[PDB]
Amino acid sequence: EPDTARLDADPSASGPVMEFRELQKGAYIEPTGAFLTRARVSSSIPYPARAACLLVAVSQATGLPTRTLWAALCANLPDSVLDDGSLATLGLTTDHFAVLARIFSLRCRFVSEHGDVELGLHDATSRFTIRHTPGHFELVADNF
Amino acid sequence: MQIFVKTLTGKTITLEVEPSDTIENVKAKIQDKEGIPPDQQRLIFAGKQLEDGRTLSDYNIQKESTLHLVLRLRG
């Protein structure tokens, strides 16, 4: 259980390991939020500008400032999930988006080289589509 | 034994596994058939997120049960 061990080793985390789905219940679209996490006041990880292409895409589609999106992640995720050691190298994941969707009521269809995945909340206020290529996120109209 | 893997699109994939196959082994088996790298694979059983180092039996995942495959993307 590498996910559980990395969370149990996180000093910024408290409580038992559980899915974000259960830590912060909401109108999730299956399987949004089904990733293991722990509860935290706020993380001090500075805005990862060079690797925030995921936040830029969400920001462009919603109008939410990129730094507003980051602050939300810093206030709801332990440091181990915000930075698993490759934050600067590999950036953010669809799990980070699942948290933003719960906080800001978002729904996004991700179009990837290896298929699509729909993540967010059911009656979301903002609906958009993001394209994934190896290592990159880009807002699109409604690809493929 | 045989287990099933169901994707977001509803497609059903059939894998041949043993109770001691690790979740990492399952992901490799899925890669052989689907072409999805383990990095982009999340597997869920009965609502629980499965972790790579555990076995099917560690989760009590028995014959002819269904795993749920979901994409995880990073960038």
Author numbering:
A (entry chain A): 7 to 46, 49 to 152
B (entry chain B): 1 to 75
Question: How did the manuscript describe this experimental structure?
Answer:
Maize rayado fino virus (MRFV) is the type member of the genus Marafivirus within the family Tymoviridae. The polyprotein characteristically contains four nonstructural domains that comprise the viral replicase (methyltransferase, protease (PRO), helicase (HEL), and RNA-dependent RNA polymerase (RdRp)) as well as the major structural coat protein (CP) for genome packing. The main function of PRO is to act as a polyprotein processor, but it has been shown to have auxiliary function as a ubiquitin (Ub) hydrolase to aid in bypassing the host innate immune system by removing Ub from the RdRp, preventing its degradation by the Ub proteasome. X-ray structures of MRFV PRO alone and bound to Ub reveal unique structural characteristics that differ from TYMV PRO and notable conformational changes that occur in response to Ub substrate.
MRFV PRO was covalently linked to Ub. Specifically, Ub-3Br is a suicide substrate of deubiquitinating enzymes that is a modified form of WT Ub in that its C-terminus is modified to harbor a reactive C-terminal tail, which can irreversibly bind to the active site cysteines of DUBs through a covalent linkage. The covalently linked protein complex was crystalized in space group I4. The C-terminal tail of Ub nestles deep into the active site channel of PRO and numerous additional interactions of the enzyme with the beta-grasp fold of Ub. Two of these features are essential in how PRO recognizes Ub, which are the hydrophobic Ile44 and Ile36 patches. Hydrophobic residues P37 and A40 of the long loop connecting ⍺1 and ⍺2 grip against the hydrophobic Ile44 patch. Although not hydrophobic, R27 is a key residue for stabilizing Ub binding at this region because its guanidino group hydrogen bonds with Ub’s main-chain carbonyl group of G47. R27 is clearly important in MRFV PRO recognition of Ub and could be a factor that we can attribute into MRFV and OBDV lacking the ability to recognize and subsequently process Ub-K63 chains. Interestingly, in the presence of Ub, the C-terminal tail of MRFV PRO adopts a conformation highly similar to the GPP flap of TYMV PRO (unliganded and liganded) as there now is a turn following β5, which allows for the formation of a 4-stranded β-sheet and a more canonical, rigid active site. Furthermore, MRFV PRO forms a much more extensive interaction with Ub than TYMV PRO, with a complex formation significance score (CSS) of 1.000 (scale being 0–1) as determined from the PISA server.
